[PDB]
Design a protein around this ligand. Structure first.
Ligand SMILES: [Zn+2]
Ligand SMILES: [Zn+2]
Lengths: 147, 278, 144, 147, 97, 48, 209, 114
C-alpha cells in the first residue's frame, strides 16, 4: 500500500487485495478493472487537509492538480475487488467523527456520495426525493431532450 | 403431526448422526469401549449368528431429536433393515436409555462361512443412507402442517340449527406429488385431498376431475390478485382442453393433436410441409 | 363536461404543502422508527446470543428474517397510518386518494413518513459484497 | 450405483483441445507427479484435515490404473481432438497440449510443469472447499469478477 | 330449493352472478308505482305464487316438451329460479317489498 | 389458435369448427356475460 | 404389517362392493356398510398366514335387472398374476357360466397376461385392477362428478334430440379411472351430472373412445 | 480417519484383512507392501458434522477493518478488552447467527464463542 500511495514501483491502477480468511493476497495489474478514487483515512482522520484544499483552490498558476493528490497519498483508486476489503466512510463530518462506536476502523472516505450517479442521472435535481424508477426514466428522457 | 410422519419421506440419512466402519474382528472384544457394555448383553445367547460372523463392523449413530421428531424408535429401524436385506445383515442395537443410539451391522454368516468384505459395507452404507426408506411416501420431499385462516381452506359444515360453521382443522401440504398413495393413507380425507398437478389428477381421478381441477387452478391464479373473470370464460377454456377426453396442451404439442383441415394446420406452423402431405 | 367546468372554479392542485406533516406528526413517526430499530436490535441480540428459537417450518435464518421483517413492516404501517391521520380535509394528496383518482395510502405514507424496506427477489438487500450489502457497513450487519 | 456411491464424488478436468474430459489425477500424472503423496501435496496443504483427504479418494481410485507419466500422457493424447497415429505421437501431442493449451497464463515454457501443478492443485483445492462448504461459491454478478 | 343450494355452494357463499337483479327491479317497481311501505298492500299472496309459476315457464333456456329438453331446461334455469322463488316469495312481497 | 372457432350455434349449443359439442349451453346457463351481475341467495346462509 | 393388512384388504372389499353396486349389481345394504371390526369379527383371527385367502375373499354378484347375469371378483394371492392363475380363473367362469370377471392385482400384472385378456375379451370380459387403485373410491372424490352410463335407448334419444353424431360428443378415454370404475367399453355414453355455479346443475355427455 | 501413505512409493495405503491373523492391515496397492493398522477404524462420516468453527477460524481475521469490534467481551487468555466478532456464514450449517470472537491483541489469536 505504501509503494502505491507513493507511486514508487506500484502504479495507481494496481489493486492489491488480501483475503485474510482465505490466506491469499491477490494483486491485479491487467486492464478492464473499474475503479474510483477514494480519500484515504488513517486513525479515524482524513489524510486530506486544509493545505491540500488551499493548493487545489489555486489550481491554475500553481501547477497543482489532481495528480498531486494521488502522489501525496491523500487519495487512491479502489477497484471492486479491493472495495470488499475496504471500510468506507460516506462522509468525514459524520462517520469518522467521535460518536457511538459503530466503527472505528474506517480505511477510506467518499469524496462525495453523489458521484455514484452517471452523466444523465447527474442532471436530475434532488434525485433522492424521487421514486427510483423515475430517475431511470429521466436518464432515458435526458438523452432525447433538445438543446 | 403423526399423520405427517407417515407421509413425509424419511430415510436413514435424516435420522442418522454418524456412521463408522470399524474393523472389530472379535465381536466379544469390541474396538469401541462404550459399545462393549451393551454388545455383551446381546451376545450371551446369540441367535442365527453363532456359526459365523463377518469380521467387519458397521456402527451407525442415530440422532435423538430427529428420532423423536419422527416418532421413530430403535425397533422398526432394525426390523426395516432386516426386512429389506432379509438375512443378509445382522443388526444389533442398544437401549434407548443410553444417551447415544447405536445399531451394529454385519454381513450374513452364510456368505462369511464374493465382491469384497470391506467395500461392500460402503456400498450398503451409502445404499442404506438414501435408497432405504424408514417411514413415509417416496417423492414427497417435505410436508408442511398449518391451520387455515381463510374460509376456502377451512372446513365448512351445516350445524343442527342449519347455519354454516367454518371449523379450524389441520391441513397438510406437501412439496411432492403422490396422489394415489396419499389418498389411500389412513386418516387422510379421501374426498377433499387434491393436487395442483393436472397430470396427477388426470391419471388418478379422470378427465372430468381434470375439468374441475383445471377450473380451480385457473380460478386460483386469476383470483390471486383479487381480479374476477366470469365463470363462462373459465368453463369454456377448461371444456375445450378436456373436450377430447385427454389432456389437450395449448402448445403445438397438444394443438397439433387436434384434428383440423390442411389450411388450419398451416396457420399454426409448418405450413409448407403440411401442404405437400395433403 | 359539467364537472370539468366546475373544477375551473374549485380548482385542484398538488404541491410541497401537501407533502408536509405536522411537527408533532413528524415526532410520532420518528419515535416509531426509533423504537422499531431498537426492536430489530433486540431480535439481533437474541439471535447472536443463541436465544432465538426457530419457529416450525422455518430455519433459524428464516425465523430471524421473518421476525425482523414483521417489526419493520409494522413500523411502516404504524408510521403510515400516523401520517395519513395528520392530513387535513384540504390536503390534495388525500383528495386524489379518497376519490380513487390516483395514488393510494402507501404512496402518501412513503411521501410523508417512510419509504420502507427495499426487497430484491422478495428478500432484504443481499450481501452482494463479502458479508456486506455495501462497503460502508460492518460485516454481518443485519440491522434495518 | 452399488460402487458408484461407495467411492463418492470424483473430480475430472476439461482441458482444451480434448473431446472428452479426463480424471483430475491423470493430469497430475502427466505433469510429472506420480506418487499420490506428491499429487495430494499440491491439493491438500494441511494433511491434518480428514475432510479434505476423503474428497480426493474417489479421484485417486479412478486414475489408479495409470501409474506412470508416459501412461498418463498417452491417455490424455488418446482423447485429443486429433488422435495420434502411434503411441509415441500421442504422447508428444499430449505434452504440447499441457505445455501451451493448459493454464497458459501460468506459463508456456518447457519447465513450467511444477507451476502448473500447483495452480491446478489450487483449482482442485478451491473446488474441494466449495464442495465442503468452507468457501462460498463465486458470484457471476459480482462486478470485481468482471472486466 | 334451499337444500339444493347447500349442495351447489357447500362453502356457504351466497354471492352469485345471475341475469336479472331482482332487488333493484323490486326497488324500481316501488318507485315507479309510488309504493307506500306503511300502508297495507293489495297484492294477493296467491297472485305472487301464481305469478312466479307463470314467469318460470316463460324463462326458457332449452326449448322442447320432451323429457330430455325439460330436464335441461330445469337445470339451465335452476339457480335463477331458486333465486326468483326466494326473492318473489309471498312472505317477502307482503312483509318488506 | 385452439379456441378460435368455438361459437354459439343457432341451436344454442357451443361448438367448434369440427362441429363437435363443447358445451350444451354456453356457460352451462345459455346466457351472455354482459347482462349478468352479482346477487345474493337469501335462503342459503340463514338458519332453519 | 400384519395388523394393518386386514384393514387394507377391507378397503378393497368396501370399494368393490361400492363399485359393484354402482355397476348395477345386487349388493346388500349391510354388505356395503361393512365396518372394519365386522370384517375382522366376522372371521376373527390373525390375518396374515391366517383365515383370509385371496381366493376366499372372492365374491359373486348378480345384476339387478337380470339375476342370471353375474360378475366375478378375483383376488390373487401371488404378488404378480401369472398366465396359469388367469387360466384358472377363466375355467372357473366356465363352470358358473359368468361372462364378466373382475381381477384385482397386488403389485403388478404379468405383461404376457395383458395380451391374454384381450384375446379372450370377446367370449369373456376380464378387467385387471391394481390393489393401490381400489384402496380409495375415486367416485367419492369431490372433484369427480356423478357418472351415469346411458343405455342405448337413452343415447339414441340424446342424439335424436340434439341431432348429433357420435363423433360430435365430448370423449372419455376407455382407460379413464372413472371409465374403468364403471367398466364401460368403446361406443358407450356417460352422462355426467355436476353442480354449476351459473346454472345450478349441468348435465354433460361423454362418448367412450 | 488417519490417512497413511506407503513408505516405498509414497502411494495411498488401503485397509486390508489377513485371514491368517485376523488383524487389520493397511496394504499398499501395486507395491506388495503392508503395514500394521492401529486405529481399527477404516471409514467414518458424520452426517450432522458438528465440526467446531473455532478450529476453522483464523486468528488473522482480527486485522480485518471491516469486522465489528466489541469491548464488552474481554479475551480470557490475556484479558484484552477489545475483540472482533463475526458469524461463520458457512454452508452446511443451516443456522448461522451465533457470534465467534477473536482477540485483537497481537500475538494472542484466542478464539471463543459465547
Ligand atoms: Zn507402495
Ligand atoms: Zn487475548
Amino acid at each position: 500500500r505504501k509503494l502505491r500511495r507513493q507511486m514508487d514501483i506500484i502504479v495507481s491502477e494496481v489493486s492489491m487485495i488480501r483475503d485474510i480468511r482465505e490466506r491469499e493476497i491477490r494483486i491485479y495489474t491487467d486492464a478492464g478493472r473499474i475503479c474510483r478514487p477514494l480519500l484515504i483515512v488513517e486513525k479515524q482522520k482524513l489524510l486530506l487537509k486544509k493545505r491540500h484544499i488551499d493548493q487545489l483552490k489555486e489550481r491554475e498558476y500553481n501547477n497543482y492538480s489532481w495528480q498531486d493528490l494521488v502522489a501525496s497519498g491523500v487519495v487512491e483508486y479502489i477497484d471492486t475487488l479491493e472495495e470488499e476489503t475496504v471500510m468506507l466512510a460516506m462522509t468525514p463530518d459524520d462517520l469518522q467523527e467521535k460518536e457511538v462506536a459503530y466503527c472505528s476502523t474506517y480505511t477510506h472516505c467518499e469524496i462525495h456520495p453523489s458521484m455514484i450517479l452517471g452523466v444523465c442521472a447527474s442532471i436530475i435535481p434532488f434525485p433522492d426525493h424521487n421514486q427510483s424508477p423515475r430517475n431511470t426514466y429521466q436518464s432515458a428522457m435526458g438523452k432525447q431532450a433538445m438543446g | 403431526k403423526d399423520i405427517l410422519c407417515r407421509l413425509e419421506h424419511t430415510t436413514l440419512r435424516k435420522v442418522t448422526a454418524n456412521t463408522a466402519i470399524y474393523y472389530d474382528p472379535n465381536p466379544q472384544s469390541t474396538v469401541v469401549a462404550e459399545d462393549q457394555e451393551w454388545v455383551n448383553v446381546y451376545y450371551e445367547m446369540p441367535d442365527f449368528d453363532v456359526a459365523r460372523i463377518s469380521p467387519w463392523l458397521l456402527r451407525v449413530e442415530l440422532d435423538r431429536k430427529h428420532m423423536t421428531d419422527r416418532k421413530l424408535t430403535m425397533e422398526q429401524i432394525a426390523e426395516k433393515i432386516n426386512a429389506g436385506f432379509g438375512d443378509d445383515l445382522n443388526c444389533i442395537f442398544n437401549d434407548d436409555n443410553a444417551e447415544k443410539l447405536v445399531l451394529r451391522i454385519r454381513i450374513m454368516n452364510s456368505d462369511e462361512n464374493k465382491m469384497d468384505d470391506d467395500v461392500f459395507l460402503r456400498c450398503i452404507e451409502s445404499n442404506m443412507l438414501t435408497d432405504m426408506t424408514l417411514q413415509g411416501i417416496e417423492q414427497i420431499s417435505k410436508v408442511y402442517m398449518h391451520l387455515p385462516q381463510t374460509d376456502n381452506k377451512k372446513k365448512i359444515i351445516i350445524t343442527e340449527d342449519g347455519e354454516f360453521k367454518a371449523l379450524q382443522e389441520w391441513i397438510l401440504e406437501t412439496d411432492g406429488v403422490s396422489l394415489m398413495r396419499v389418498l389411500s393413507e389412513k386418516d387422510v380425507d379421501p374426498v377433499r385431498t387434491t393436487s395442483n398437478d393436472i397430470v396427477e389428477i388426470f391419471t388418478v381421478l379422470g378427465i372430468e376431475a381434470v375439468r374441475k381441477a383445471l377450473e380451480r387452478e385457473l380460478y386460483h391464479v386469476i383470483s390471486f390478485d383479487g381480479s374476477y373473470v366470469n365463470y363462462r370464460h373459465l368453463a369454456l377454456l377448461c371444456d375445450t382442453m378436456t373436450c377430447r377426453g385427454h389432456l389437450m396442451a395449448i402448445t403445438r404439442h397438444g394443438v397439433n393433436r387436434q384434428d383440423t383441415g390442411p389450411l388450419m394446420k398451416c396457420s399454426f406452423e409448418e405450413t409448407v410441409d403440411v401442404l405437400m402431405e395433403a | 363536461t359539467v364537472i370539468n367546468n366546475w373544477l375551473l372554479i374549485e380548482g385542484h392542485t398538488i404541491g410541497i404543502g401537501d407533502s408536509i406533516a405536522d411537527s408533532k406528526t413528524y415526532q410520532d413517526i420518528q419515535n416509531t422508527i426509533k423504537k422499531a430499530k431498537q426492536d430489530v436490535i433486540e431480535v439481533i441480540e437474541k439471535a447472536h446470543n443463541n436465544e432465538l428459537e426457530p419457529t416450525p417450518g422455518n430455519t433459524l435464518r428464516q425465523t430471524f428474517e421473518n421476525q425482523v421483517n414483521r417489526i419493520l413492516n409494522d413500523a411502516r404501517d404504524k408510521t403510515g397510518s400516523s401520517a395519513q391521520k395528520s392530513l387535513s380535509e384540504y390536503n390534495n394528496f388525500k383528495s386524489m386518494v379518497v376519490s380513487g383518482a390516483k395514488g393510494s395510502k402507501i404512496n402518501i405514507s412513503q411521501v410523508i413518513a417512510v419509504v420502507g424496506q427495499q426487497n430484491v427477489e422478495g428478500k432484504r438487500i443481499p450481501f452482494g459484497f463479502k458479508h456486506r450489502t455495501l462497503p460502508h457497513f460492518i460485516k454481518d450487519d443485519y440491522g434495518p | 450405483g452399488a460402487k458408484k456411491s461407495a467411492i463418492g464424488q470424483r473430480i475430472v478436468a476439461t482441458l482444451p483441445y480434448i473431446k472428452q474430459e479426463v480424471p483430475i489425477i491423470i493430469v497430475f500424472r502427466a505433469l510429472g507427479f506420480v506418487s499420490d503423496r506428491d499429487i495430494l501435496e499440491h491439493i491438500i496443504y494441511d494433511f491434518e484435515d480428514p475432510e479434505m483427504m476423503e474428497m480426493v479418494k474417489p479421484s485417486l481410485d479412478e486414475a489408479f490404473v495409470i501409474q506412470e507419466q508416459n501412461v498418463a500422457l498417452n491417455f490424455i493424447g488418446s482423447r485429443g481432438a486429433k488422435p495420434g497415429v502411434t503411441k509415441e505421437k500421442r504422447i508428444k501431442y499430449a505434452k504440447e497440449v499441457l505445455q501451451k493449451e493448459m493454464l497458459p497464463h501460468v506459463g508456456v515454457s518447457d519447465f513450467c510443469e511444477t507451476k502448473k501443478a500447483y495452480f491446478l492443485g489450487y483449482m482442485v483445492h478451491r473446488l474441494l472447499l466449495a464442495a465442503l462448504g468452507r468457501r462460498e461459491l463465486d458470484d457471476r454478478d459480482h462486478y470485481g469478477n468482471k472486466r | 330449493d334451499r337444500e339444493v343450494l347447500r349442495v351447489i355452494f357447500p362453502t356457504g357463499d351466497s354471492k352469485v352472478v345471475l341475469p336479472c337483479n331482482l332487488l333493484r327491479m323490486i326497488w324500481n317497481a316501488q318507485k315507479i308505482f309510488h309504493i307506500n311501505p306503511r300502508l297495507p298492500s293489495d297484492l294477493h299472496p296467491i297472485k305472487v305464487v301464481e305469478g312466479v309459476k307463470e314467469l318460470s315457464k316463460k324463462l326458457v333456456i332449452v326449448n322442447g316438451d320432451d323429457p330430455l329438453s325439460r330436464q335441461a331446461q330445469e337445470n339451465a334455469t335452476l339457480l335463477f329460479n331458486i333465486h326468483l322463488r326466494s326473492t318473489l316469495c309471498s312472505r317477502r312481497m307482503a312483509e318488506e317489498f | 389458435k385452439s379456441m378460435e372457432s368455438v361459437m354459439v350455434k343457432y341451436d344454442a349449443t357451443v361448438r367448434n369448427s369440427i362441429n363437435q359439442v363443447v358445451q350444451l349451453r354456453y356457460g352451462e346457463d345459455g346466457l351472455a356475460g354482459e347482462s349478468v351481475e352479482f346477487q345474493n341467495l337469501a335462503t342459503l346462509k340463514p338458519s332453519n | 404389517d400384519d395388523e394393518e393388512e386386514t384393514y387394507r384388504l377391507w378397503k378393497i372389499r368396501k370399494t368393490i362392493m361400492q363399485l359393484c353396486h354402482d355397476r348395477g349389481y345386487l349388493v346388500t345394504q349391510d354388505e356395503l356398510d361393512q365396518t372394519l371390526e365386522e370384517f375382522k369379527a366376522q372371521f376373527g383371527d390373525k390375518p396374515s398366514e391366517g383365515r383370509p385367502r385371496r381366493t376366499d375373499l372372492t365374491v359373486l354378484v348378480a345384476h339387478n335387472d337380470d339375476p342370471t347375469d353375474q360378475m366375478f371378483v378375483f383376488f390373487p394371492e401371488e404378488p404378480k398374476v401369472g398366465i396359469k392363475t388367469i387360466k384358472v380363473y377363466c375355467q372357473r367362469m366356465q363352470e358358473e357360466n359368468i361372462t364378466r370377471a373382475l381381477i384385482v392385482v397386488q403389485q403388478g400384472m404379468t405383461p404376457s397376461a395383458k395380451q391374454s385378456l384381450v384375446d379372450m375379451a370377446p367370449k369373456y370380459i376380464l378387467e385387471q385392477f391394481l390393489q393401490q387403485e381400489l384402496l380409495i373410491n375415486i367416485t367419492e372424490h369431490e372433484l369427480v362428478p356423478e357418472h351415469v352410463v346411458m343405455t342405448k335407448e337413452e343415447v339414441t334419444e340424446l342424439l335424436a334430440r340434439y341431432k348429433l353424431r357420435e363423433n360430435q360428443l365430448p370423449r372419455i378415454q376407455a382407460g379413464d379411472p372413472v371409465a374403468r370404475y364403471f367398466g364401460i367399453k368403446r361406443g358407450q355414453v356417460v352422462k355426467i351430472i355436476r353442480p354449476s355455479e351459473t346454472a345450478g346443475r349441468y348435465i354433460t355427455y361423454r362418448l367412450v373412445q | 480417519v488417519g490417512i497413511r501413505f506407503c513408505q516405498e512409493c509414497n502411494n495411498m495405503l488401503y485397509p486390508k484383512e489377513d485371514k491368517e491373523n485376523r488383524i487389520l492391515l493397511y496394504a499398499c496397492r501395486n507395491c506388495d507392501y503392508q503395514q500394521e493398522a492401529d486405529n481399527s477404524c477404516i471409514y467414518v462420516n458424520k452426517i450432522t458434522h458438528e465440526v467446531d468453527e473455532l478450529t476453522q477460524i483464523i486468528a488473522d481475521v482480527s486485522q480485518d477493518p471491516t469486522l465489528p469490534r466489541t469491548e464488552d467481551h474481554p479475551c480470557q487468555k490475556c484479558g484484552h478488552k477489545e475483540a472482533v466478532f463475526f458469524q461463520s456464514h458457512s454452508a452446511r450449517a443451516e443456522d448461522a447467527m451465533r457470534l465467534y470472537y477473536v482477540c485483537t491483541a497481537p500475538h494472542c489469536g484466542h478464539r471463543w464463542t459465547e
